[PDB]
Ligand binder design. Structure first.
Ligand SMILES: N=C(N)NCC[C@H](O)[C@H](N)C(=O)O
Length: 332
């Protein structure tokens, strides 16, 4: 038994999906261009039927922390070396796989980016950046990426975070945890459902981690003057989760909130588990049910580092209307 739902492509299905992505790469100039953003969800209807059935059903299941699709071929020679930075990471070798991720994502919802993250790209990059080993962002390595809800600070955070493993030669684990419902007593649960916590945007939204835009103003407002929010929402028997293990804090001087958050931290630490995304594996993490992170690892810096493409997905773009930063697909 596993806490995520898993699908493995047959070689023929994987080949068909790859061919569709390659065709898109031939026909559109970029993945984040207006044209492909609009067309991808309909082109995705041509993906292998068994995969479409999996995506449609698994998303409606009550339990999974992620939807995992194994078996997409990746040829390291065609892919080329791991980029040294996200800025130069739209390499020709990675381009078809970026289209593939977008097509899969279009089966689950509306893709979007952030004006304040990797230049507002929709398909973003996860890779280790030399000098940035001990940071709190996804280009870290030697320091573990602590568990968190993606963009916890924001009402407009993704419903799903998609990850496509381009290479992962040393098998570094992604970490996941759900709400620790088997261990949270009722009183603690009660407190976590109340608006008694603070966050802050994570460091990926800092100007220094981009190559402004007015949207950085909103990040500052969120960091300097966070509004108290709940950590748990929805059904008490299956709550949605909004927390960042590093940045969450209790409301000022609220020791009962603090106790609940401390207990939560301990229970999530104790229940955190590993998912290894091997080369060609794709995961869609349910960002309402689960926190995620990434284990510490020693970076290589030899051209073959671990490298993922990544994408934020919402079930409803209109929920972030307020934050539509000039365009509906880049938020802030
Ligand atoms: N490090 C913590 N706890 N949170 C922020 C990490 C996030 O995954 C951020 N969006 C990033 O990609 O680096």
């Amino acid at each position: 038994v596993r806490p995520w739902s898993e699908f493995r492509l047959t070689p023929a299905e994987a080949a068909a999906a790859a061919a569709l992505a390659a065709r898109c790469a031939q026909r559109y100039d970029e993945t984040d261009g207006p044209e492909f953003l609009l067309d991808a969800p309909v082109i995705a209807h041509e993906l292998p039927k068994r995969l479409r059935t999996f995506m449609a059903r698994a998303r409606l299941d009550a339990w999974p922390h992620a939807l995992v699709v194994r078996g997409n071929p990746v040829d390291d020679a065609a892919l080329g070396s791991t980029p040294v930075h996200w800025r130069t990471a739209r390499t020709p070798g990675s381009r078809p796989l970026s289209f593939l991720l977008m097509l899969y994502a279009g089966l689950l919802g509306d893709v979007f980016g952030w004006a304040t993250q990797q230049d507002g790209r929709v398909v973003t990059d996860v890779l280790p950046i030399k000098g940035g080993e001990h940071t709190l962002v996804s280009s870290s390595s030697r320091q573990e990426l602590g568990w968190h809800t993606e963009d916890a600070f924001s009402p407009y955070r993704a419903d799903y975070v998609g990850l496509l493993s381009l290479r992962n030669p040393d098998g570094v684990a992604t970490t996941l945890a759900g709400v620790p419902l088997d261990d949270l007593d009722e009183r603690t649960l009660d407190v976590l459902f109340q608006e008694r916590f603070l966050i802050r945007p994570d460091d990926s939204h800092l100007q220094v981690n981009n190559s402004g835009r007015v949207e950085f103003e909103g990040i500052a407002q969120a960091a300097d003057r966070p509004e108290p929010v709940a950590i748990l929402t929805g059904h008490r028997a299956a709550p949605h989760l909004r927390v960042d293990g590093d940045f969450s804090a209790p409301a000022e001087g609220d020791e009962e909130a603090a106790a609940a958050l401390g207990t939560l931290r301990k229970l999530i630490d104790a229940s955190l588990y590993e998912l290894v995304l091997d080369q060609g594996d794709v995961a869609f993490i349910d960002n309402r049910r689960a926190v995620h992170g990434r284990r510490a690892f020693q970076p290589r810096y030899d051209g073959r580092d671990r490298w993922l493409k990544r994408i934020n997905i919402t079930r409803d773009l209109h929920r972030s209307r307020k934050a539509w930063a000039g365009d509906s697909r880049v938020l802030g």
